[PDB]
Design a protein around this ligand. Structure first.
Ligand SMILES: [Zn+2]
Length: 274
């Protein structure tokens, strides 16, 4: 066991999934820090250094990392793989990014099985000496992720179907909302320039009042102020922060992808009174 194979991912969700497949034979690091906003992140010369010293680079695609392709052309002779191949996208519904793929495909546990398989294939292709380890680690982790779905599905099924309105800040939850049958309401369709402008806030306020939706949420990499303004003006409680675009730090409450899905579903269910 000389040097461990080095994998660099764009953001922390992919880091944790990939590290479970890598096990003990590769080290996986994320370019972005826990808590950092990932869509419009601005890479630095230190990020270039980290990617250039990798043996493999992994990114989401599906219009997530607006910085990645320009960043990756600075990198020489390091292979890359997009980990969302074979996932059917949901289009963004409005705004300047309307009609392109919503990147947040990892919020569906069923989609996460495809993430696992794509990362396994990339590690097996670019580090073939360790293929048996990657294959065994991916099979074990996919078992965990597959078993994850049933308790989450049952928990959220407790909410009456016509009350399943998921009101968030970024429209980051479309794939989870589809899996578990929630109608989707958000203050902005995807992180970008405008986030909590008027018109956005008022439309969401209107939908909450018409349907008496009991709760509204924010997310861990953006500002909680728009969601709190929405809850102040309506009958909705502020349900707290959901995790979607980043893990917490390793010593925080959301250290892993599994903990992210569990925590987001728990916080939603609690917002509806379980
Ligand atoms: Zn996002």
């Amino acid at each position: 066991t000389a040097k461990k194979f080095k994998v660099v991912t764009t953001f922390t969700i992919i880091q944790d999934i990939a590290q479970n497949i890598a096990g003990d034979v590769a080290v996986v690091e994320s370019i972005t820090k826990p808590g950092a906003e990932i869509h419009d992140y601005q890479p630095t010369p230190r990020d270039i250094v980290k990617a250039q010293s990798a043996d493999l680079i992994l990114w989401n695609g599906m219009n997530l990392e607006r910085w990645f392709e320009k960043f990756f052309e600075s990198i020489k002779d390091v292979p890359s793989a997009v980990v969302t191949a074979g996932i059917t996208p949901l289009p963004i519904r409005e705004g300047p990014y309307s009609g392109i793929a919503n990147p947040h495909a990892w919020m569906s546990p069923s989609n996460a099985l495809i993430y696992i398989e794509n990362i396994r294939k990339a590690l097996v292709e670019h580090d073939p000496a360790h293929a048996e380890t990657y294959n065994r680690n991916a099979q074990a982790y996919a078992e965990k992720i597959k078993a994850l779905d049933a308790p989450l599905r049952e928990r959220l099924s407790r909410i009456p179907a016509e009350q399943r309105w998921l009101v968030t800040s970024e429209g980051a939850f479309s794939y989870l909302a589809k899996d578990y049958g929630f109608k989707e309401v958000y203050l902005w369709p995807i992180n970008a320039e405008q986030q909590g402008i008027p018109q956005q806030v008022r439309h969401v306020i209107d939908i909450i009042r018409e349907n008496k939706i009991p709760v509204v949420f924010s997310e861990s990499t953006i500002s909680d102020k728009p969601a709190k303004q929405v809850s102040k003006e309506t009958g909705a409680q502020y349900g707290g922060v959901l995790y979607v675009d980043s893990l917490s730090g390793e010593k925080g409450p959301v250290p892993t992808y599994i903990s992210l899905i569990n925590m987001t579903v728990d916080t939603i269910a609690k917002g509806f009174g379980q």
